[PDB]
Ligand binder design. Structure first.
Ligand SMILES: C[As](C)(=O)[O-]
Ligand SMILES: C[As](C)(=O)[O-]
Lengths: 301, 304
């Protein structure tokens, strides 16, 4: 058995405040003897609009460097290793700007106990949706990724990584299992409407489809994305402020048979951590008994 | 603006004549309820005791199908009203199969129109070869030969129909292909086990519905099956010890909208045959696809 921690939190537009929360969760995870901690999409910030995101993305590299230092500090202080999977934003590179692509990068970092970034997964499927009872277009601020993420040989086993919308495209999850995934993660900032309808369904489905443990770290609650300093500098009227967002939470861990084995406590309000012990022998037993990957029709599909 | 579907739940025996009677009653009920199409489960002609039994019964299936074709035209004529029928049956191996040393039966999903014309015979692609958790070892491939073709989209009275069977549901790329080809409605006629049914039946149907943004129809076998066949047991020189033929199906037949909402579901208080009805809404389906345009947002540059 190996221990995973899944974090649930509520990002503001203040990267400093968000970093403090992130650090506390990582510290809690080490104290609870988790070997890896998984944090949601956009753990560095959430923004009011594309202009705001571009402004905040400039601050993200410092957030990441301070986080790297904080992990090595926490590991050394507690005398125990932990790896961190965390959703952040990155600003466009110098080359991107020259090519006329001034969009930010929605990225999932895997940072090991040495504070080294082992992977930077850039979100492949962008959330451009008329949410059933606001009209969202992530591609107005965000640039899509160019590559399928490699499987990570984590302390928990073979890990396949994805972000939010990615979960809705089953071919991605299937590919990660084909590449050797035993564990999938979907750090997310889900809406209330789609969360109530599909969050648990999609997580359990991916787990059952792929015979993988599935980790679902989610943003939760009502966000306050106000940023007086940005609002002043860009000369905003209060009428064009868009600082309210709300996220579904219900962060969970699902076993390869679709059983929810850990779930966020709905009665606790702030950031929270959930723990699960993962069983490699149960995973192997499920795959042995129902050998889906020996039964696919690759000749046709 | 709405189109009515009927989904049948039944309990097949090894007796093709008895099974036909039940199928005929359900189709009759569907026409009376003004369903445009009726969907029946996998193995609606028969279920068997073992691979040898299946091969023996499959020889009787062509007669079953001809009688069914005739029954449909008779029912259409007598009610002055059209219906199409989707039904899981078995078929014996072809001469070409036999020449290749393949005497296994075909697990096929038939689409039959109101004139009794067979429009499609989809031969099941993925076969149920699994060790059931706290259950029996099952190997469909011992009795059944896997298909070699992706089923064409059927332009049914309800809309564009993508067809699959049972175990096919567990392979998301199949349902994804059906939607890519233009499906608006998916069907998974099944004979699902108790153990896997309790765990995954509702999950898989709802998942496929929301994955593909299609209506999903799930006609299921239900109950403890009577696989008794005295004349065949005699012919096979089967002892009473070998005669213990136990099989049980999950049922819980349902219809699911493209958002994953269950809109019709079998009554759990019946273990016998029953029909459920649903009105399918084309506007809702198109609305969902418009608001979340998944098929405009895939990464074919990476997956394929
Ligand atoms: C019994 As036939 C040859 O119409 O499938
Ligand atoms: C043919 As006998 C009744 O001896 O098994």
């Amino acid at each position: 058995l190996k221990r995973v921690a899944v974090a649930q939190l509520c990002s503001s537009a203040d990267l400093t405040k968000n970093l403090k929360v992130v650090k506390e969760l990582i510290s809690e995870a080490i104290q609870k003897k988790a070997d890896v901690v998984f944090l949601p999409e956009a753990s560095d910030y959430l923004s009011q609009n594309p202009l705001h995101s571009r402004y905040l993305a400039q601050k993200s590299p410092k957030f990441i460097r301070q986080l790297q230092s904080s992990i090595t500090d926490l590991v050394r202080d507690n005398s125990r290793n932990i790896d961190v999977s965390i959703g952040v934003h990155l600003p466009p590179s110098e080359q991107d700007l020259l090519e006329g692509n001034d969009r930010v990068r929605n990225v999932l970092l895997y940072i090991d106990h040495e504070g080294k970034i082992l992977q930077e997964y850039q979100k492949l499927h962008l959330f451009d949706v008329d949410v059933p009872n606001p009209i969202l277009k992530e591609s107005k601020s965000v640039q899509p990724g160019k590559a399928i993420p490699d499987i990570i040989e984590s302390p928990l086993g073979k890990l396949g990584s994805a972000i939010c919308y990615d979960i809705r495209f089953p071919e991605f999850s299937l590919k990660l299992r084909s590449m050797g995934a035993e564990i999938l993660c979907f750090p997310s900032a889900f809406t209330i409407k789609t969360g109530e309808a599909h969050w648990e369904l999609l997580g359990r489905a991916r787990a059952v489809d792929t015979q993988c443990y599935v980790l679902m770290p989610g943003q939760v609650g009502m966000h306050d994305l106000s940023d007086p300093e940005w609002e002043k500098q860009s000369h905003m009227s209060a009428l064009e402020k868009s600082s309210r967002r709300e996220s579904w939470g219900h962060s969970m861990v699902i076993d390869p048979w679709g059983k929810i084995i850990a779930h966020a406590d709905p009665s606790t309000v702030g950031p929270q951590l959930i723990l699960a012990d993962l069983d490699r022998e149960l995973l192997q037993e499920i795959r042995n008994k129902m050998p889906l990957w020996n039964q696919r029709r690759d000749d046709l599909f």
